[PDB]
Amino acid sequence: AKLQITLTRSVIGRPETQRKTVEALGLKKTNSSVVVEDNPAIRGQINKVKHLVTVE
Amino acid sequence: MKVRPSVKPICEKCKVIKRKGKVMVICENPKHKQRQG
Amino acid sequence: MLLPKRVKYRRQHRPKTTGRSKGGNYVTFGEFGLQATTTSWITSRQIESARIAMTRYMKRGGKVWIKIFPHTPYTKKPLEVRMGAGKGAVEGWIAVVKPGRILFEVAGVSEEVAREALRLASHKLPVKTKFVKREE
Amino acid sequence: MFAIIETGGKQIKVEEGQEIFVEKLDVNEGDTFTFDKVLFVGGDSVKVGAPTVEGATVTATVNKQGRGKKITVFTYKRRKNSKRKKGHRQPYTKLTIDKI
Amino acid sequence: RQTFMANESNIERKWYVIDAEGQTLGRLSSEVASILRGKNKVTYTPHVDTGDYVIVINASKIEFTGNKETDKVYYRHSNHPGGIKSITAGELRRTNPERLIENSIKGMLPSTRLGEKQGKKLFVYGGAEHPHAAQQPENYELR
Amino acid sequence: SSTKNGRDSESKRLGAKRADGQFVTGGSILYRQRGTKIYPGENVGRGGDDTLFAKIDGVVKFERKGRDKKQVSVYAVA
Amino acid sequence: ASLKSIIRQGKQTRSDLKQLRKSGKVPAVVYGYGTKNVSVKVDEVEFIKVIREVGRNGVIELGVGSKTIKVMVADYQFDPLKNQITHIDFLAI
RNA sequence: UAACUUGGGAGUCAGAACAUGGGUGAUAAGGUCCGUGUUCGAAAGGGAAACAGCCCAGACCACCAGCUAAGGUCCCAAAAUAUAUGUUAAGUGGAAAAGGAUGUGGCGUUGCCACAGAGUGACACUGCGCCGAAAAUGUACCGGGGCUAAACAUAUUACCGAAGCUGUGGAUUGUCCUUUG
């Protein structure tokens, strides 16, 4: 409820390992946003796909 | 007049100069004249 | 002609050739040394050619120390052959020189004549060199 | 005297007694409509600002609700047996600006 | 729909004159190509030529930067085996001054049927006078 | 210009078959090896092929047997 | 001549060490008696000058933590390709 | 948001380039054989002048609406002849090495305070350039015109730019029956 993650870059040309991390956050389409509460588990996920998403 | 890509002085009298963007070596002895190095 | 008297396997994989040197980065035996700033293979025939051209300038002055040795052998297939049908045959012995390893060492001479001796030895090798001394 | 109104995602410059075609509207044929968002009023009148000027609404009467001419959407890939043909008729609404 | 297009009826072309005394070749030819094309006004209408007539006086005294008077060579062939001619830039300014300027401008226009009618609105003269005094060309400052 | 090499044998899948802290049955195989890389701890036997199997149920744990050696044990649940 | 030194806190990233070796400074560590491995910084050209005076086996009046400590140079790393040092150790006496 | 089990019907067994870890070859090949990713295959659209495999991005249909990505903003050709501060004279950019040299900047070392008066010698360490540099129809390794900044570094502000995304209508399937919707 305090973190909002939006998808900037596309998943084409990315390893399949990084495609499962975006699907585990709820980002289907490009420029889509979600609201999640911060925690050690959710913070390490956006740290894996840092170059594909931005956090406000 | 020698035309070699490695122009160097041979004795103490010779001198190295630059003419029209090219390394020249003019010396008192006409033997030690080199160009284009 | 430097070559080991015996080896376990005549045919070996070629060295890595990429990276940086492990040891031999300082001058321990002599006084004036010769560093390397480029990576390449030093054939044993290129060593005897540089050693003769170096010790000749110093008729009987001092001693020279060869710091490398051609342990690794390389192979080459005969002329006019297609690919496959096995491996080649030993043709020489090489070493691996990386930026920082001392190649030759000279002692027993002066500083002004050590530069001329190590200069004629550097034109025989396929790498770029730098005149170095012992560290403080 | 003209005005710039935003009606169907686009912007149109209107004039008194003019036939314009816009996107489909929920109003019936013969009734009236009123555009609330006006972006610019000029021409003969005094110049006004933006994004939306105070009041200055436009009223217009509905004329007809029909469909445009039919098109044929055909695409294909060569050497690959995959073709598809579609059809389309886009609906529209005609209005007449009676008062600016 | 709601966009204005200019046809043959509502087009007004003006005559301008440019002075080439103390200007660079390439820096001057680019701005003249804009006047000939018609991109200076709000009624562009790409499929119709709306440009203006322009006149360039003092075709001589065209300045070069660097060693361009000698190291710039103009090549041309003649559809004959081995036939190829070459003229340096410094020599072209001495013999045919207008050709040096007229070809640098025509190389910036599009090569079409309409891009050929626009290049015919240029008149370059080496002297300081122009014969077209019947019209009223107004001077123009390059920006 | 023929050669004399080119022959090899089939790979024998060795190594660990159960992880650490996993629940096993009373006849499961814990390790295939050639020799004794891991010694049989308590509640773990040793086969005729130096295979390590478990005798009872419970969690499997790898331990250390002195210096530069190790063993594997099985403890009952609860 | 005395080693005028400053301190650096936290964990210095890899980029800042490269930026430290370019501005003319050298990292060092004092791990003597009671100093508790205090990480310290020092100038490059002022270190070569002082060791020429006293010698390789001489004491140094180093100022760390805004106080004087008598330390010597135990060992240092040297990059032979760029004829300059990269690290200094200080064993307090 | 998928996995496993049972049954019905299949196709495939000639793969390619690119990045990377390695054998073989000659630290040759758009070579050949393996490991790990991506795209093509079966993928339209924008960029690289043209160019299945490279960079950006996955087309349900319609619109004379808006915002961005990679790449770009003197003219061809949509958008800065934008701002501050330096470097480079070769048309370098917009083809090549060992080696040679008073080309020109930046930061240092150090002995005579003369060399022929305020300047003067010798090295270390780096930025950008010069020589080495010769092929066959026609300029011909900038896409063209042309350019000493419209070149290269560095630090900030605008804008252009795709079938990506948003805006406004419409056709289907599926799923919640918050609204026979």
Side-chain angles (χ1 to χ4, degrees):
Chain A
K2 284 147 181 48
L3 259 66
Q4 197 174 26
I5 292 91
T6 173
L7 183 67
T8 61
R9 315 283 281 195
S10 164
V11 298
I12 317 164
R14 293 301 172 176
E16 191 168 320
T17 299
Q18 307 188 18
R19 288 203 184 100
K20 297 178 171 303
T21 310
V22 176
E23 192 163 60
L25 289 156
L27 311 162
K28 272 193 278 290
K29 306 283 288 302
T30 317
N31 308 356
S32 45
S33 279
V34 287
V35 196
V36 288
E37 200 56 277
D38 55 42
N39 55 73
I42 203 81
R43 181 76 73 156
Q45 273 172 345
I46 44 180
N47 174 267
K48 172 155 172 284
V49 287
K50 180 212 318 177
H51 61 289
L52 291 173
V53 297
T54 185
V55 186
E56 194 196 358
Chain B
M1 180 68 115
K2 312 180 184 73
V3 192
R4 323 184 291 200
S6 164
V7 289
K8 287 166 300 192
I10 308 185
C11 47
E12 67 159 299
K13 287 191 301 172
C14 303
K15 196 189 173 183
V16 174
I17 57 176
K18 192 189 189 61
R19 281 178 181 174
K20 292 182 183 292
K22 286 172 187 62
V23 194
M24 292 273 297
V25 172
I26 53 162
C27 205
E28 294 294 327
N29 182 8
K31 188 79 71 66
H32 312 154
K33 278 178 54 181
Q34 314 148 74
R35 193 186 61 81
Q36 191 260 320
Chain C
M1 192 81 90
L2 304 189
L3 59 96
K5 52 168 63 65
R6 64 171 307 178
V7 303
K8 209 148 189 282
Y9 296 106
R10 307 288 290 176
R11 306 171 184 175
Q12 316 186 9
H13 283 173
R14 274 155 270 153
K16 193 198 180 63
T17 324
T18 302
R20 207 160 297 278
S21 87
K22 305 190 50 190
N25 308 124
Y26 321 105
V27 188
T28 47
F29 274 105
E31 190 35 78
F32 313 106
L34 180 134
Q35 266 196 352
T37 60
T38 318
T39 305
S40 199
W41 290 352
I42 306 301
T43 304
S44 45
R45 305 209 295 180
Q46 310 172 9
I47 299 183
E48 51 165 309
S49 194
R51 185 195 51 89
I52 290 174
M54 168 162 36
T55 194
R56 184 199 288 113
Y57 189 83
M58 314 174 297
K59 297 106 185 170
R60 316 146 293 275
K63 185 160 175 53
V64 70
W65 281 277
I66 295 180
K67 300 294 293 299
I68 68 179
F69 199 84
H71 295 280
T72 317
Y74 62 93
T75 81
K76 173 174 194 56
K77 277 174 88 80
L79 282 195
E80 195 144 4
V81 288
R82 297 193 197 260
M83 313 312 283
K87 212 182 149 64
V90 176
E91 300 270 290
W93 304 80
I94 44 172
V96 196
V97 170
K98 297 196 186 181
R101 190 174 283 274
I102 320 290
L103 304 190
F104 295 93
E105 276 179 47
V106 176
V109 286
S110 77
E111 186 193 326
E112 65 256 7
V113 309
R115 306 193 73 102
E116 188 73 24
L118 289 173
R119 199 183 62 85
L120 305 178
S122 42
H123 289 88
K124 309 299 193 301
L125 314 162
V127 305
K128 318 194 83 160
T129 53
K130 194 183 77 161
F131 181 84
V132 284
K133 305 171 182 54
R134 272 211 192 196
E135 306 283 47
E136 57 98 19
Chain D
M1 192 147 157
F2 58 83
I4 299 172
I5 53 172
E6 173 142 346
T7 170
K10 322 157 179 58
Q11 306 179 355
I12 306 179
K13 193 171 79 66
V14 292
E15 268 194 79
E16 285 183 354
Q18 204 190 293
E19 304 260 349
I20 60 175
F21 297 78
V22 300
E23 305 276 354
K24 185 184 184 184
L25 292 173
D26 281 25
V27 285
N28 293 18
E29 172 180 7
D31 280 338
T32 180
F33 198 79
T34 294
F35 301 101
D36 307 288
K37 304 197 63 168
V38 178
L39 285 86
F40 189 81
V41 194
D44 296 8
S45 200
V46 195
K47 268 65 61 185
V48 284
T52 314
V53 304
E54 58 89 9
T57 198
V58 176
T59 61
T61 184
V62 186
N63 279 99
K64 181 178 172 49
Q65 277 192 359
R67 286 182 170 180
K69 57 187 169 61
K70 198 171 81 78
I71 80 167
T72 305
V73 193
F74 188 95
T75 66
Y76 77 115
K77 308 263 184 176
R78 52 162 176 244
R79 295 186 296 268
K80 268 77 189 181
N81 284 322
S82 81
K83 69 206 199 312
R84 180 202 68 166
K85 183 205 306 188
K86 313 291 295 178
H88 185 72
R89 300 203 66 191
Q90 173 88 349
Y92 69 92
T93 297
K94 190 169 76 80
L95 290 91
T96 315
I97 303 293
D98 46 48
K99 176 60 65 177
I100 288 181
Chain E
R1 280 76 159 180
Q2 210 177 7
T3 309
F4 163 70
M5 301 299 188
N7 59 5
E8 282 85 7
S9 88
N10 51 333
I11 289 178
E12 161 81 27
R13 302 185 184 80
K14 300 276 200 310
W15 286 78
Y16 306 100
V17 61
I18 320 294
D19 203 306
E21 172 89 331
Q23 309 278 81
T24 316
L25 167 68
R27 304 279 183 155
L28 182 138
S29 315
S30 88
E31 300 143 340
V32 177
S34 301
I35 301 177
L36 283 176
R37 203 156 182 250
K39 327 197 64 175
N40 303 160
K41 56 182 67 65
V42 308
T43 61
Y44 179 48
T45 302
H47 73 90
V48 168
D49 50 333
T50 51
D52 300 356
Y53 303 92
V54 71
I55 294 167
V56 183
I57 66 180
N58 290 96
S60 43
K61 204 91 198 83
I62 282 281
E63 308 296 325
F64 298 105
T65 316
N67 283 293
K68 283 202 199 73
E69 40 172 20
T70 318
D71 302 3
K72 187 156 193 174
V73 177
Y74 291 109
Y75 302 94
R76 64 180 177 177
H77 200 273
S78 62
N79 300 89
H80 279 263
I84 175 164
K85 319 294 160 57
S86 47
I87 295 97
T88 187
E91 200 206 27
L92 197 70
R93 184 158 41 84
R94 276 191 290 258
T95 42
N96 220 318
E98 55 166 346
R99 184 166 307 170
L100 175 64
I101 315 303
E102 196 145 61
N103 279 22
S104 80
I105 298 188
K106 283 169 184 167
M108 307 189 182
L109 309 173
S111 44
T112 57
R113 294 194 188 195
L114 189 82
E116 271 185 307
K117 308 172 194 173
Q118 294 174 347
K120 300 181 171 306
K121 302 198 180 68
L122 177 59
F123 311 98
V124 175
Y125 299 100
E129 293 89 5
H130 51 87
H132 324 270
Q135 296 84 357
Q136 281 93 342
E138 200 163 58
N139 281 66
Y140 182 93
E141 301 309 306
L142 302 174
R143 66 189 186 180
Chain F
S1 276
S2 88
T3 73
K4 295 187 296 300
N5 308 326
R7 50 195 168 273
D8 202 358
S9 76
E10 203 144 31
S11 279
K12 269 74 182 177
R13 284 88 187 177
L14 308 180
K17 300 311 170 195
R18 285 293 181 268
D20 187 18
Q22 193 180 359
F23 176 82
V24 303
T25 43
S28 314
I29 290 166
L30 277 304
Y31 208 78
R32 316 294 282 255
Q33 53 187 359
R34 292 276 100 82
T36 54
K37 290 193 174 56
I38 295 184
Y39 288 84
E42 72 178 38
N43 301 329
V44 163
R46 204 172 78 102
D49 207 9
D50 297 358
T51 310
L52 301 196
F53 68 101
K55 302 178 184 170
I56 73 160
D57 297 333
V59 287
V60 57
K61 288 189 174 302
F62 290 83
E63 294 179 353
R64 310 210 308 105
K65 183 197 200 71
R67 176 181 293 263
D68 280 278
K69 272 160 171 48
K70 59 170 68 67
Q71 62 170 22
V72 56
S73 298
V74 164
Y75 313 107
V77 76
Chain G
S2 277
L3 262 63
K4 196 53 63 63
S5 63
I6 71 152
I7 321 298
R8 40 190 180 90
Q9 270 92 22
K11 172 186 294 181
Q12 193 172 190
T13 42
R14 188 192 290 265
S15 186
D16 294 332
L17 277 170
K18 198 171 309 160
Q19 187 178 2
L20 213 67
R21 284 186 177 91
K22 197 149 280 206
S23 179
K25 298 295 184 302
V26 169
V29 173
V30 194
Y31 55 98
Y33 301 168
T35 43
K36 189 52 161 152
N37 289 75
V38 51
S39 278
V40 70
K41 199 182 311 186
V42 69
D43 210 321
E44 204 147 347
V45 311
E46 289 296 336
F47 177 70
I48 304 168
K49 187 174 304 303
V50 55
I51 66 154
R52 286 178 180 175
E53 195 291 319
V54 54
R56 172 69 157 97
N57 289 317
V59 309
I60 297 174
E61 322 312 318
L62 157 74
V64 72
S66 64
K67 74 176 183 179
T68 299
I69 181 64
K70 306 184 73 180
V71 290
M72 48 203 198
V73 178
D75 42 46
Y76 53 90
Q77 297 171 0
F78 204 101
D79 201 78
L81 312 163
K82 290 151 62 179
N83 60 42
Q84 78 172 6
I85 72 156
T86 63
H87 196 258
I88 314 172
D89 273 28
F90 282 121
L91 176 65
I93 69 172

